[PDB]
Amino acid sequence: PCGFVVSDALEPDNPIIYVNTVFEIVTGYRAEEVIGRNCRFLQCRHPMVDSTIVAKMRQCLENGIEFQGELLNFRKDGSPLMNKLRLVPIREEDEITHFIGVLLFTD
Amino acid sequence: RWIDGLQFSSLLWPPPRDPQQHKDQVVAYVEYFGQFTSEQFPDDIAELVRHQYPSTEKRLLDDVLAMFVLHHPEHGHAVILPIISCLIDGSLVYSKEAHPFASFISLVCSEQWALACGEILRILTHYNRPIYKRKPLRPLSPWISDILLAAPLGIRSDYFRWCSGVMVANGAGVILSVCDDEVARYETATLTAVAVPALLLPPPTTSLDEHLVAGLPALEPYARLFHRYYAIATPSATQRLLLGLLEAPPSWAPDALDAAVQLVELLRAAEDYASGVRLPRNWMHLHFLRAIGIAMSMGVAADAAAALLFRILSQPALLFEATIEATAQGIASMLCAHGPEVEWRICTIWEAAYGLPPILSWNLYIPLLKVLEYLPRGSPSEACLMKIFVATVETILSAMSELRAMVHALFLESCAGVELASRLLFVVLTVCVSHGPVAAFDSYVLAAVCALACEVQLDSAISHTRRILAILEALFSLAAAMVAAHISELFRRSKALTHALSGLMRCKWDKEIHKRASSLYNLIDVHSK
Numbered sequence A: 001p002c003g004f005v006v007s008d009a010l011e012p013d014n015p016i017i018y019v020n021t022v023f024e025i026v027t028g029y030r031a032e033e034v035i036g037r038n039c040r041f042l043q044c045r046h047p048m049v050d051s052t053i054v055a056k057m058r059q060c061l062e063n064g065i066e067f068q069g070e071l072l073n074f075r076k077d078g079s080p081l082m083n084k085l086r087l088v089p090i091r092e093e094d095e096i097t098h099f100i101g102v103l104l105f106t107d
Numbered sequence B: 001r002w003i004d005g006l007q008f009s010s011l012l013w014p015p016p017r018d019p020q021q022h023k024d025q026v027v028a029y030v031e032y033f034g035q036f037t038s039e040q041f042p043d044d045i046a047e048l049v050r051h052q053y054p055s056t057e058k059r060l061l062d063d064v065l066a067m068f069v070l071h072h073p074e075h076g077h078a079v080i081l082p083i084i085s086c087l088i089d090g091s092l093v094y095s096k097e098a099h100p101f102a103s104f105i106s107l108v109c110s111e112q113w114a115l116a117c118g119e120i121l122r123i124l125t126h127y128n129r130p131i132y133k134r135k136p137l138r139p140l141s142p143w144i145s146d147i148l149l150a151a152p153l154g155i156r157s158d159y160f161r162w163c164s165g166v167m168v169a170n171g172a173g174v175i176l177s178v179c180d181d182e183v184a185r186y187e188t189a190t191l192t193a194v195a196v197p198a199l200l201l202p203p204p205t206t207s208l209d210e211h212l213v214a215g216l217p218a219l220e221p222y223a224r225l226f227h228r229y230y231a232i233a234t235p236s237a238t239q240r241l242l243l244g245l246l247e248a249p250p251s252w253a254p255d256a257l258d259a260a261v262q263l264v265e266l267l268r269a270a271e272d273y274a275s276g277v278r279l280p281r282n283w284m285h286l287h288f289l290r291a292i293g294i295a296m297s298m299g300v301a302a303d304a305a306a307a308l309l310f311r312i313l314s315q316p317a318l319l320f321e322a323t324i325e326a327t328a329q330g331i332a333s334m335l336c337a338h339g340p341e342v343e344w345r346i347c348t349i350w351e352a353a354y355g356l357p358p359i360l361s362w363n364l365y366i367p368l369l370k371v372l373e374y375l376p377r378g379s380p381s382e383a384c385l386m387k388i389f390v391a392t393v394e395t396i397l398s399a400m401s402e403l404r405a406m407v408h409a410l411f412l413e414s415c416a417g418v419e420l421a422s423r424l425l426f427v428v429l430t431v432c433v434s435h436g437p438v439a440a441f442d443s444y445v446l447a448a449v450c451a452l453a454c455e456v457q458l459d460s461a462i463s464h465t466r467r468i469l470a471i472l473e474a475l476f477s478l479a480a481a482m483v484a485a486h487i488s489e490l491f492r493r494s495k496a497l498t499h500a501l502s503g504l505m506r507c508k509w510d511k512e513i514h515k516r517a518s519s520l521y522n523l524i525d526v527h528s529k
């Protein structure tokens, strides 16, 4: 079961706009708390989440390339999971206006 | 010396059954007792009571003790207090038929009688502070109750006026503890029924001097009392109660409105912890909103209830599952029933309430949606909530980007109403173009549509697509032809939306999603150009 998320890359830090229903039920974070926030927070940082893999995203995010990787993220319950994120830059004219994260949670 | 004398009298043996000898004999001892009244008298009776009590037989000593207090209230202190101390000790258990108390309950059931009665209650109040010697309790709370119970309504009302300080133990403490003992041991609540009018409403005018100089007490401690009274009070009684407080003179209340609102705070607060009595599910509407409107419907009394709604709607915590529906449903109903004239006022009070004051936020409007669902079609009330809507949207436009989440909510949260949300989002978009913000609305649609379109193709997820198609399908239908031009221009200048619609068209996994997706598309085509 994939959870989905979208970011407006035209704003600063790509704030979230959409949250899939399963994301709402497997992160405890209903849409209202996380919209306008970037998803920088799902790992919060916390020392044990791999520092490199997080930096590899932001580098990959600038040029606008697909990134597939796997971090451990935790609900605000503190209970941790890990997913393989797929971040998909979407563009048309062709400027990266939106981002789509397709993350598949696994505790 | 003299205690030792009456030690073998008929004072300690059961009262003669003859009424005439009962009366003649008691008349004789009350004069023997009262002959002394020396410095020693309190010390004298104190030895007499602890030594001679408690016994289980009915004795003539009870009646001499009880009467001497009546004929000499000046010395009620020296008589009751030895008993008070043993009640504190545990020497005496208090039974309403325990025999020192059997008669003091009986003398109370005539101005001489009233004063003696009064002082008995005035004494027992001061010693009634809580002790622990199994919760800690107030030792003399129940005795006050049975005396107050077996008593005319005139003195109960004056006991609570005196006790709460309308004109040593906490005044608020005893009233709560004697009102509970009645509820606790008896199965009714008549003392709390006289106490709540006693605190909120002024003395009766016929009692002039008292009436002129009296003040509303501090209502903070009697927050349970009001809950318990309002939990049981027939709805007609509370509207009698509220109006009386509303149209009281200003010497009574600094601001009666502040106190009427304060009362509401306390029943709401006591609702979370009160046990045994639960307020009705429409308690905010039933005991208040029903009444507050009618005042407007029926001289200057109507004028003061109008100040309450401005007060009620300038502090929007009334809206703060089923209580919200009923609270919201109630607001809708008081609007409809009262008449066109009052609705125009209610609505203009509402506008003056919301800064047209509190700030305006989308979170403020989530409750009014549940009110608006119940409103009828085309009424000025609907217009008023939609007018406050535009006010909210105007204000948010003026960092955290509440707007981005708002549109998500109308589009998909089901907060609810596809009928409303189509109408609501139409307003939302129209405000953004006036002022960028229009990109936000432009941007979210693609994100939601395409993310949900991808999820379906790859139970709740399919349900939301249907809703978004219908909201957009209806945005075409309902500057109604003008927004339609914008959506069609939005869809076919972005290749992502273009693809997502097409796959939805051909989806048979869900019957209604592709009937719907087809229609939206054809609507895009015609309004595209």
Ligand SMILES: *OP(=O)(O)OC[C@@H](O)[C@@H](O)[C@@H](O)Cn1c2nc(=O)[nH]c(=O)c-2nc2cc(C)c(C)cc21
Pocket: A005, A006, A007, A014, A039, A040, A042, A043, A054, A055, A057, A058, A061, A071, A073, A085, A087, A099, A100, A101, A103
């Ligand atoms: O500054 P930093 O190096 O911390 O940034 C890297 C990321 O942590 C952050 O910038 C986001 O881009 C990462 N991100 C997620 N990070 C997570 O830990 N869990 C997730 O589920 C994430 N989903 C994301 C989805 C999208 C669309 C983006 C753009 C980023 C993202």
